Amino acid sequence: MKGDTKVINYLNKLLGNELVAINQYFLHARMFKNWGLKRLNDVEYHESIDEMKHADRYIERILFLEGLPNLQDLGKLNIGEDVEEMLRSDLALELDGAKNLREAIGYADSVHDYVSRDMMIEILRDEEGHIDWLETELDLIQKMGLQNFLQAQIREE
Amino acid sequence: MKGDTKVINYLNKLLGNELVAINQYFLHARMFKNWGLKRLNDVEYHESIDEMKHADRYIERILFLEGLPNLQDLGKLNIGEDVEEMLRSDLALELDGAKNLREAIGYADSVHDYVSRDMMIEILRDEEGHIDWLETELDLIQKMGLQNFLQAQIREE
Amino acid sequence: MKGDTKVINYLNKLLGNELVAINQYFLHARMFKNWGLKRLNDVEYHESIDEMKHADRYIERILFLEGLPNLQDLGKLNIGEDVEEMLRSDLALELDGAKNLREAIGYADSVHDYVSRDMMIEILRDEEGHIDWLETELDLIQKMGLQNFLQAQIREE
Amino acid sequence: MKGDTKVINYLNKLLGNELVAINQYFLHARMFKNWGLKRLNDVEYHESIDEMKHADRYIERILFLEGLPNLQDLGKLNIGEDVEEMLRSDLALELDGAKNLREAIGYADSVHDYVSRDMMIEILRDEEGHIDWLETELDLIQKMGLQNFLQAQIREE
Amino acid sequence: MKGDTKVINYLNKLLGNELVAINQYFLHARMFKNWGLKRLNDVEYHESIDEMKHADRYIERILFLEGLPNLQDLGKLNIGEDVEEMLRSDLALELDGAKNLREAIGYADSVHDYVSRDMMIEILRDEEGHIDWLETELDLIQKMGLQNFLQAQIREE
Amino acid sequence: MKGDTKVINYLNKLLGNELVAINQYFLHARMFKNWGLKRLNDVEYHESIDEMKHADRYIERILFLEGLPNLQDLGKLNIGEDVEEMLRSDLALELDGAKNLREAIGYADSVHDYVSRDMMIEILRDEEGHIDWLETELDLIQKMGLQNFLQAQIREE
Amino acid sequence: MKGDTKVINYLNKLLGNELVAINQYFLHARMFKNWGLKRLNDVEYHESIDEMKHADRYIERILFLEGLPNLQDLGKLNIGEDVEEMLRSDLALELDGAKNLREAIGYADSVHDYVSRDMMIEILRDEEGHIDWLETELDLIQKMGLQNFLQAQIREE
């Protein structure tokens, strides 16, 4: 079914955001794992999986609308070197992606692509959940101190 | 994640509507229970629980958006003294709450808080279900008469 | 069964105490949940439910005694802004409520309303349990320090 | 263990109340059963059994306290000839029994027989439950009319 | 179905016998229980229940035959103060009751109330079973001596 | 929660009574066991355990009220040398303890410590059950003679 | 079987040690419980139970040997006011008891009471296990600091 060209453009932009996040979350997860911070590996691994699911949804939607999914161009990663930097980088990436989602959701409505919009609202709900987790962890580091926070990560849940 | 100030205000207003409904539905249920009208107790109790779940959702959303949930102010209850009066009061409260929801849902869209909107639309769907039940019960009283209607309530369904 | 007017007045005052506590405990719970302090959310949520059960018993007893339950007036909440403040506010509310329960229990005995008295003694036993938990948590914050205390809350027991 | 003479006298008076109620509830039940009012038979039969249990408790307590249970004297029954008359007679008997219970409960406290008091408070709680049911049934007859009320009794609940 | 007036009169006399026996057996059971003679409590309690079942049958039959069951008048109890006295009193009561049953069975036959007769023959068979047990226990007391007999009662079979 | 000083003093006096009973019942139990009187060992062992549960309740209540449980002072035991002496000594101890409980229950009510009172009434009910068993055994020894009584103890129940 | 008088004297001395430990461990356990230190309550409670089992063994052995178990005299308790004091007091008590056990074990051998000796060696093995636990906890307090140690006690295992 031939979709709106700019809708497809937004879907490719959002897919691009998810592709950066998949890689950034996955590497962060395995850095945490290497450091013995098992609980952080578990959560970040699951966030990477969540973003893969989102990417799959964008890819399938673009193909249905007869566009070409772009998996070639990869945006800038910001890995970081310690726990706080890594979490802040993930939060910043999530915030940027949420801005793009809001723009795309408004546009899809204006051209009556309500199914693409509905998909994007569900994804935005998921991303706000990631944002809530990241903000919460960052605040916990400040409240209990980094040493107590690290100790809390060494055994799974 | 810092939310829009007026969105937070709307959520607190809607929370306020739920807090009134929680108490009014609960007291109505136990009044029905005292009178031996078990089926009406069962339904109204469940509606009270439903509004508690709505209140929980508003409280959690407000806190996420970094606002302060208002559980201090409580609007006017209208309890009534007989079955028809009690059900009509509940209906009037639901209709006023629906008006407030429609206004909030439109505004949330305008400022692109699509997740708050999605939550409110789900709540509005629940409230229209309560409105349907209440309108139906009131019409049944008129159709079969109050005496037959009350007899129908003395065993749970 | 027509009850003693002043017993009903006491029952309404105690119901009033429970209604403040329901709201305060629930908001505290969700504030803790937002901060990622899962254990504190779990306990405070269950205390809110306990106060709801107490309120239900008061409402049913008042109706049996042919009085009018008052769910319209809500007393002053004291939310607080940090963990120690919130816990101290809950403890102060519990202590005020226990004072009211003692007065009502003494009065019910003097007018031979032994069933109302029996109900209130069970509720007072529940409240003294909440007092014990709150005092214990506050002492633990002193003994192990706030940072260690917070770390201990981030996984559900 | 030798008990207080006046407490033993109270227990025998209360036992006497239970003995009247056992017979009156049982005959009412079987009258309802004859008339095809199965649901009223079920409830009144259960109330009769409840009073048998109370009588058993009085008999055992009296013997423990080294007194002589009096099962020889039987107070006046008031059977009645129609449903409303029968239920009102049961209610009147319950209310008279409750007055005697309150007097006995106060006196047992005065002579420090706290175990006899504890037993009586539990029994009074049961009696107030019967009073609640009776009052409710009588109000239902008034609200839905006798014909509708009788129709509602012909299937066991 | 309008029964024979004299049959109804006999059924009320027999009911009257059952009512005395219900109370006498039950008090005897609990006296035995107080004394630690568990086996005697168990048997006498079950005999009390058997007489309750008999009373229920009389009440239902009288009501079917359109008569008025008399539960108001209570004949003379003879409690006794020691085991042998109590058992002999129960036996004397059973023998008096069997006399009345024989008269009533003969009369019911003469007026063709064969269903009332059938009911009473079953009840008489039950009563002869109680007579057998009582006679046997009294004989055992004489044969093994009271002290051995009491020892044999201090556990439930 | 700071309790009343004299309530705490009563709780420690009652704890003292329980500590004596725990030891006396336990030694009596093992003396019975040594003699081959298994049934008496079983009951007295269980009574010792019951008193341990009571002691635990007093200890926990005292600590909650911010007092200091006294486990250092131990009252006078009266062991006895034969079955009758031992049981009579246990009975005298129980009677002394019930007297202290009655005084403490009255006082707790007067200072409005209704939860301490409720706990003590439950314990008093337990103690009256022990009194009943002890009185019953002593009477059985008289009624069947000591030789028959001992024979009845050599097999468990 | 008539035992050696001085063996019985040692068994009573050791029983005396166990009686002090039962009370000291139990009170310590409930102090820990009051403080919210659940893991310490659990272990100290179990140590109290272990000492009760030892006391039972001494009591039964003394009775077999035809001596008189002494449960009347209670040695000095040393409760303490904080975690470290309490644990050190328990350790000191265990060390004193172990000295007495070694003396008694040597003596029992010299008079050929090998079964009493065998019992005591098993008990000494148990006590050395308690000593190992107490020493370990005390060292942990020093190594991780008291605040970390307390935090580790708040959830069971």
* D157 touches B at CB < 8 Å: yes
Neighbours of F144 (CB within 10 A): 24
Q: How far apart are alpha carbons F118 and C119 in whole angstroms?
A: 12
- Chain D residue closest in CA terms to C64: D132
- What chain D residue is nearest to F118 in terms of C-alpha separation? D118
Pair C15, B23: CB distance under 8 Å: no
d(CA F33, CA F84): 15
Identify all chain D residues contacting C115, using CB atoms and an 8 Å cutoff. 121, 124-125, 128
Tokens in use for D136?
């409710």
Of residues G59, G60, G49, the one with CA closest to residue G22: G49
Q: CA-to-CA distance for F125 and F122, rounded, in angstroms?
A: 5
Q: In 10 A of CB D18, how many CB atoms?
A: 22
Closest CA to D71 of E127, E78, E11: E78
* Separation in Å, CA D69 to CA D9, D15, D61, E88: 9, 8, 9, 20
Q: Are F130 and E29 in contact (CB under 8 A)?
A: no
Task: Nearest chain D residue to F130 by CA: give it.
Answer: D1
Other beta carbons within 10 Å of A76:
7
Q: Residue D88's domain spans which residues?
A: 1-157
Identify the sign of the CA torsion E11, E16, E22, E25.
negative
> Is A5 in CB contact (< 8 Å) with chain C?
no
- Interface check for D106 against chain C (CB to CB < 8 A): the answer is yes
- For residue G154, with 0-12 CB atoms within 10 Å meaning exposed, 13-18 middle and 19 or more buried, which class applies? buried
User: Residue D50 annotated as binding?
Assistant: yes
Under an 8 A CB cutoff, do E154 and F151 touch? no
Give yes or no for D137 touching B (CB within 8 A): yes
Distance from CA of C76 to the nearest CA of D (A): 34
Backbone torsions φ then ψ of D155, nearest 5 degrees = -120, 130
What is residue G92's three-state secondary structure? helix
Identify the residue among C38, C82, C151 best suited for mutation to test binding to A, counting A beta carbons within 10 A and taking the highest: C151
Which of E34, E35, E154 is the closest to F152 by Cβ? Answer: E154
Inter-chain CB proximity E155 and F157 less than 8 Å? yes
**Whole-angstrom Cα distance, residue F26 to residue C126?**
34
In angstroms, rounded to a whole number, what is the distance separating the alpha carbons of residues C53 and D119? 25
Token pair for residue G51?
């000492």
Going by the DSSP 8-state scheme, the letter that residue B2 receives in this structure is: P
* SS (HEC) of chain A: CCCCHHHHHHHHHHHHHHHHHHHHHHHHHHHHHHCCCHHHHHHHHHHHHHHHHHHHHHHHHHHHCCCCCCCCCCCCCCCCCCHHHHHHHHHHHHHHHHHHHHHHHHHHHHCCCHHHHHHHHHHHHHHHHHHHHHHHHHHHHHHHCHHHHHHCCCCCC
DSSP symbol at E36: T
Contact G71, G19 (CB under 8 A): yes
Per the CB < 8 A criterion, the answer to whether C140 and G150 are in contact is: yes
Phi-psi region of F145 (alpha: psi -120 to 50; beta: other; left: phi over 0): left
The CATH number of the domain holding residue C45 is 1.20.1260.10
B107 touches chain D (CB under 8 A): no
Say if G and D touch: at least 3 Cβ pairs within 8 Å.
no
Alpha-carbon gap, residue F25 to F87, rounded angstroms: 9
Three-state SS at C82: coil
Which secondary structure element, helix H or strand E, spans residue C41, and what is its range? helix C38-64
Subunits that touch chain G (at least 3 Cβ pairs < 8 angstroms)? C, F
Q: Which is it for the CA torsion G105, G110, G114, G115, positive or negative?
A: negative
- The closest alpha carbon to B157, from B132, B127, B137, B143, belongs to B137
> Which long-range CB contacts under 8 A does A154-157 form with residues at least 24 apart?
A154/A36, A154/A37, A154/A38, A154/A39, A155/A38, A155/A39, A156/A38, A156/A39, A156/A42, A157/A39, A157/A42, A157/C155
Check: CB of residue A109 under 8 Å from CB of residue A9. no
Output the six-digit token pair for E106: 């003969």
Judged by a CB distance cut-off of 8 A, whether residue G66 touches chain F is no
Asked if the C-beta of F33 comes within 8 angstroms of chain G's C-beta atoms, the answer is yes
Q: Is D153 helix (H, G, I), strand (E, B) or coil?
A: coil
Report the gap between the CA of B4 and the closest CA in chain C (Å).
18
Within 8 A by CB and 6+ apart from B93, the residues are B17, B20, B21, B24, B78
Give the up-direction half-sphere exposure of residue F148: CA atoms within 13 A in the CB hemisphere: 20
Residue E29 Cα distances to D64, E47, E83, angstroms: 14, 9, 11
Domain count, chain E: 1
Q: Is residue E36 less than 8 Å (CB to CB) from chain D?
A: no
Residue identified by tokens 């007093």 is F58
d(Cα D39, Cα G5) in Å, to the nearest integer? Answer: 76
State how far the Cα of G101 lies from the Cα of G10, in Å rounded to an integer.
9
Decide if F127 contacts F97 (C-beta within 8 A): yes
DSSP G112: T
Fill in the DSSP letter of residue E128: H
Q: How far apart, in whole angstroms, are the C-alpha atoms of residue B112 and residue B134?
A: 34
- Distance between CA atoms of residues B45 and B51, nearest Å: 10
What sections of F65-113 are H helices per DSSP? 83-110
DSSP state of B3: P
Degrees, nearest 5: CA angle A31-A37-A43: 80
- Chain F within 8 Å of D63 (Cβ-Cβ)? no
Helix then strand then coil, in percent of chain G rounded to 5, is 80, 0, 20
Answer positive or negative: Cα dihedral of C89, C95, C100, C105: positive
- Across F72-91, b (16+ Cβ under 10 Å) vs e yields bebeebebbeebeebbebbb
For residue D132, the chain B residue with the least C-alpha distance is B34
Upper half-sphere CA count for residue A149 (Cβ side, 13 Å): 16
Angle at B23 between CA B21 and CA B27, to 5 degrees: 115
Residue type, B128: E
- Give the gap in angstroms from C-alpha C110 to the nearest C-alpha of chain D: 9
> Which residues of chain E are within 8 Å of residue D63 when distances are taken between CB atoms?
30-31, 34
Gap between the Cα atoms of B56 and F95, Å rounded? 56
Distance of CA F6 to the CA centre of its chain: 22
What angle is formed at CA A41 by the lines to CA A35 and CA A43, rounded to 5 degrees? 150
- B151–chain D Cβ distance below 8 A for any pair: yes
Method for this entry = X-ray
Under 8 Å between Cβ of G150 and G93: no
In this structure, the dihedral spanned by the alpha carbons of residues G48, G53, G58 and G64, taken in order and rounded to 10 degrees, is 160
CA B56 from chain centre, in angstroms, equals 13
**In A, which residues are within 8 Å of C36 by CB distance?**
136-137, 139-140
Distance from CA of B151 to the nearest CA of D (A): 6
Residue in C80, C79, C83 with CA at minimum distance from that of residue C33? C83
- C54: CB partners within 8 A, 6+ apart: C18, C123, C126
Phi, psi of A65 (to 5 degrees): -85, 5
Q: What residue has token string 């069962």? A: B42
For an interface test with A, the pick among C154, C155, C157 (most A C-beta atoms closer than 10 Å) comes out as C154
Q: How far does E77 lie from chain F, in Å, by closest CA?
A: 26
